[PDB]
Symmetry: C6
Subunit: 201 residues, 6 copies
């Protein structure tokens, strides 16, 4: 049930007029499409075919870890999770509060634009707080903006400084580009909607 249902409440009836309402969510889908291709495909090799030229037992495991703490496809994953949360927390805040107020005062809209158009504004703030919280780590945590073919790993139980090699560090980067590019694009659309709610207050 991954993707189709998040839109049943995420693609709500009639919220705003900016042409960036759907655009942002079409990417949200696109961006989980590109990741549901990367993950199962290019990262399985991450640990397997990660070769350290040393016979020294501890080394290779320690050399992956010291170098790949939260692997990229689990970061990319967490991104799509956190930045998914505001989207579905709001849609949840709506289908609840709207269903509630309605069926309670029917037997016995200033608060529909009040309560909900307000949490949605702070959501949009949350979206770009997350989309940028990770975009940050993904750039600070991981030794520049990509990954090298080999790394020189000083992991504890290696003898002195040893070599190791990653698997397809280009295909791995390629997908770090797209996912980082679309991570920026999806930042601007998010900030444009936080901008439009700062223009008319």
């Amino acid at each position: 049930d991954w993707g189709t249902l998040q839109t049943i409440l995420g693609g709500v009836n009639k919220h705003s007029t900016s042409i960036g309402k759907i655009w942002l969510t079409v990417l949200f889908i696109f961006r989980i499409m590109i990741l549901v291709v990367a993950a199962k495909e290019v990262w399985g090799d991450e640990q397997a075919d990660f070769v350290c030229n040393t016979l020294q037992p501890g080394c290779k495991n320690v050399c992956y870890d010291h170098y790949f703490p939260i692997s990229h496809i689990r970061l990319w994953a967490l991104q799509l999770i956190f930045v998914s949360t505001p989207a579905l927390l709001v849609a949840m805040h709506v289908a609840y509060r709207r269903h509630e107020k309605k069926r309670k005062f029917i037997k016995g809209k200033v608060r529909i634009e009040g309560s909900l158009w307000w949490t949605y504004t702070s959501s949009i703030f949350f979206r770009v707080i997350f989309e940028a919280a990770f975009m940050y780590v993904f750039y600070v945590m991981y030794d520049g903006f990509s990954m090298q073919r080999l790394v020189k790993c000083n992991a504890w139980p290696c003898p002195n400084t040893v070599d190791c090699f990653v698997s397809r560090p280009t295909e791995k980067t390629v997908f770090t580009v797209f996912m980082i590019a679309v991570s920026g694009i999806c930042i601007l659309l998010n900030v444009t909607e936080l901008c439009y709610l700062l223009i008319r207050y």
Copy 2:
């Protein structure tokens, strides 16, 4: 059918007014999202790439076991199962008792707030009894609050004291943080709802 259906009875029609009703369940989903990422991804290596530097047959298997009795992702799993149980036992207690009493005295609400708002109170008690029963083990069972890069394992059939090394013990811990953090957060929301039912009695 995992997740979408638990909400069909779990996201009940109209129970209470605390803003922590949905919040708790949005996490419940989030928390099964983070775990349905961890499991199949970072724990496959647990046993495979767990390296003991010894030639001594028995050792490595014994060194995983003596050290990883109920692996983390099956604990995390059990958590989400037990803490899932009160949620769906109540929702089950409702859709049954409500469907029953209704279609039986229609041909031939003091007990709807009696029977059900009462078992729900003891449920909320159960939720935090489990969320904290495991949160306990997960902290007492597993040698501090995380896992080291290497362990010194005295498993029987090793010669004296041998080394062994885990796979991505940081990525493994990273996910033990989030899942332990969200395990605490989901404790408070649970205890706030047990608090609100202790305030007005």
Copy 3:
């Protein structure tokens, strides 16, 4: 379609008033949840990482087999299958006979409580006959109530008496406890319903 459809007919409209009607089925689900975690996760290693300290070809294969004839997770599986059968054979006996008698004498309830409340009584008998038929094997077949870290295996083509070692025999036992505990609990609820049909006849 596993689990959600068994309830569409299993959790029928309005059968009895004992609070153990749903309780038993909530476990039935719980118990297929715990097993759909165990299986694919902890038992893959059963054969793989089962190490016999011998160079003697035949041995390891023979030592698994002579020692793990019907592995636990396929027993647990068979349990949930057989004890699933009465539940869905009755629900099948109902939605058929009820749909039949109805649409045949409408154009041209002593037998609804006769035929069906009677096969259901023998079902409850069947449930506890199976839940206890396996609970039996699972306790008699498998060398006490758990599994050791190593076994001393005399499988034919090993030289004399050799050692072998299992994988995570604790995590494996842990899940033999829960599944054997819940196998007992689900016995009592079954026998309480066979008791209530022995009380009022």
Copy 4:
């Protein structure tokens, strides 16, 4: 869509009164349940952990093949497929011919019991022709009624007579029993329905 849909047309509205109408199909499900447990679980090892004690290249591959031509779980599979065919060919012959004749002579039941109750009789004949066509092979093709722990394989490129060993040949047999037992039971119910159509003609 495997299982739930075959019953939408396979469990038709109102065909006959023998108590073996559903019984046979409840097994049909049961029997695909037991096999959807066996297959992915116990047979993966078939080739992998099949060990021939020889260094002679050709041998092991030839020794599996000469000995496991159509492996059991693909036979079991074929059975459930062929014996599935009459069931769904008839159900297909009905929902077509019944939908056809109806909506064609409404604008502009002697042939409903004629055409369909007749192909259904030959179906029941087909079912037991298949259920017994394989039951036959499964007993004649495979060296008695089970499998040994080791086989002495004379496959071409082995040096003279070599040993080889299978994986869990008991667990493998256990599941050959159940599936062969239920293959007999499902023969009798099929022949009882061919008997009841031979009694009243």
Copy 5:
């Protein structure tokens, strides 16, 4: 969504009266059933357990390729895809053109039997053009009508003429029979329908 939806437009409302209309599609299903058993099961070994008795690096990879260019289960796959295309292109040509003409001249059947019963005739031609285009390759491409236990492979980087051995080449052939037999049967039904449209013109 593989199989169930192809019939929603494929199992059309009311096209012709030949008893080979459903028969052909019941096989189409059967034939994707047999292949969705073969593939994931018997061909995984194709490359893995393909053993060439040589130490010569290049060899084994080259000996699979030069000998298994488009492996059988990807041919079988392509067949079911191409021969699936006319079936769903027509069903697509209908549900479009029929929905179009109808809702356009309702506000403001000589072309329903014209346009559609005509492309359907050329479809049936296409079906047997594909079913026989592959049936051809599958017989011409692959060294006779089956596969041997061993092949003598002259792949470039082998030293002179080397041996190699396949995995379960009988189980592999067995499934090449059925799928080639049903590939012939599904040719005749296709040609019988092209015959019936050549009889009455």
Copy 6:
């Protein structure tokens, strides 16, 4: 939910009359069918069975990467993703703008052919911009139009010039043909629709 839902909005109600409207989308499906066969099947081996004849640690990993930067099945994937985007962005632009304008001026078609028939024209431009943006890379990036049996790889940490060998480079090419052929065909249908919107303006 992959494929069936893209059509619910992709294959909209009633857009144009060219016989290339469905044809293009029938391929779009066909083309994701051929790829959902290739990927999981023929590319798993890409890295695994990629053999470099050298003992030199770094080499093999570097020799795959320097030679397979974004592997084919992830390109093919990205293609079907990008060229999928205009299709679903438009269908998204419609079901939103059409649902919006309608339910807003009903209580209180020059812009339906204006706004939407115009973005759809630029979509068709986008489709062929992507379909040809990759078709380009797929031909320029990858050393001619196919792949050789062996490559001579000069990857850094190899000693001088080493050999390596790919897996099934023919089966891999075969599927590069179809997917490149259908990548051209799906270019023309796209350009014919951009042509028909250039003919009548």
